[PDB]
Design a protein around this ligand. Structure first.
Ligand SMILES: NCCCCCCOP(=O)(O)OP(=O)(O)OC[C@H]1O[C@@H](n2ccc(=O)[nH]c2=O)[C@H](O)[C@@H]1O
Ligand SMILES: CC(=O)N[C@H]1[C@H](O[C@H]2[C@@H](O)[C@H](O)[C@@H](CO)O[C@@H]2O)O[C@H](CO)[C@@H](O)[C@@H]1O
Ligand SMILES: [Mn+2]
Length: 272
């Protein structure tokens, strides 16, 4: 097989995105025949240079996830990516830890295949233009740049939350993500700090291509804003040295290969 072209010729650009109709994953699987068990896909006609593991931090967001799968799968295939979907389900009912789940995702996906790119996506964010590439670049990539919830523009120029993509080397270079941001807030800013402290800059598509929809939702229980977040992001430079991949432990409780995704239920513990 020849290499796929640099930019996919299958893209159609702007798309209509809606969250008011029911979704049946059996039907989605039928509509996405080429997606193999566990949510894996690679083009039949050419070799993609993008071996992407898409990591979703998760707990009790099945409805959002259904929308995510319905919209992203068609888009990811048009982008001609060699990809896999991983939903990192946090076991238990204690305080949520988005970033630690993301680290679990990186480490576990690597056990399945030689992925060299990682897209970290919240479960409720849908891209509105398939020209917004869900793969890696020479610098860390911020993907969800123009979210409807922020008035279709960045909330601040150093905002790196929502959806992003880091190559395997970029992720390893920053010792991954912090493991001690329990509850909502700041871990994305910590991550931005890590990248900057390791000589990188944020790459982004333009605001039109990067237009993204956030599924309106209410606060989840057990993910209360973390009061010590402002203090933690002020010391990233020092803490990133020993907090992240090199200080990570967890216990996978279950791995389920669904037609459209692999769900890893994991026990990431509680504080300290
Ligand atoms: N007015 C309504 C207030 C809603 C504010 C809740 C915070 O909203 P956001 O900043 O979108 O963050 P969030 O969606 O709650 O958390 C980000 C991401 O963590 C994941 N997440 C978080 C909490 C939870 O219980 N389950 C879960 O899966 C999910 O991928 C989510 O998209
Ligand atoms: C540290 C933090 O809370 N970061 C979140 C960021 O916070 C905003 C604002 O709400 C904070 O008061 C100031 C403090 O300097 O920083 C930012 O301007 O908001 C983002 C979007 O909701 C979150 O993703 C960050 O985690
Ligand atoms: Mn949300």
């Amino acid at each position: 097989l020849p290499a796929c072209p640099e930019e996919s010729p299958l893209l159609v650009g702007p798309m209509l995105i809606e969250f008011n109709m029911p979704v049946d994953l059996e039907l989605v699987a039928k509509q996405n025949p080429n997606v193999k068990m566990g949510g894996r896909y690679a083009p039949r006609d050419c070799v993609s240079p993008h071996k992407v593991a898409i990591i979703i931090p998760f707990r009790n967001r099945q409805e959002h996830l259904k929308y995510w799968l319905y919209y992203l799968h068609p888009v990811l295939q048009r982008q001609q990516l060699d990809y896999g979907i991983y939903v990192i389900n946090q076991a238990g009912d204690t305080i949520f830890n988005r970033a630690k789940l993301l680290n679990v995702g990186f480490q576990e996906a690597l056990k399945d295949y030689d992925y060299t790119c990682f897209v970290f996506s919240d479960v409720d964010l849908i891209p509105m233009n398939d020209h917004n590439a869900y793969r890696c670049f020479s610098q860390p990539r911020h993907i969800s740049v123009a979210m409807d919830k922020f008035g279709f523009s960045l909330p601040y120029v150093q905002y790196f939350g929502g959806v992003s993509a880091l190559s395997k080397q970029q992720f390893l270079t920053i010792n991954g993500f912090p493991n001690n941001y329990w509850g909502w807030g700041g871990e994305d800013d910590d991550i931005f700090n890590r990248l900057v402290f390791r000589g990188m800059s944020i790459s982004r598509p333009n605001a039109v291509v990067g237009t993204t929809r956030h599924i309106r939702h209410s606060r989840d229980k057990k993910n209360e804003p973390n009061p010590q977040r402002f203090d933690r992001i002020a010391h990233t430079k020092e803490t990133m040295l020993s907090d992240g991949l090199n200080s990570l432990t967890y216990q996978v409780l279950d791995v389920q290969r669904y037609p459209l995704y692999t769900q890893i239920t994991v026990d990431i513990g509680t504080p300290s």
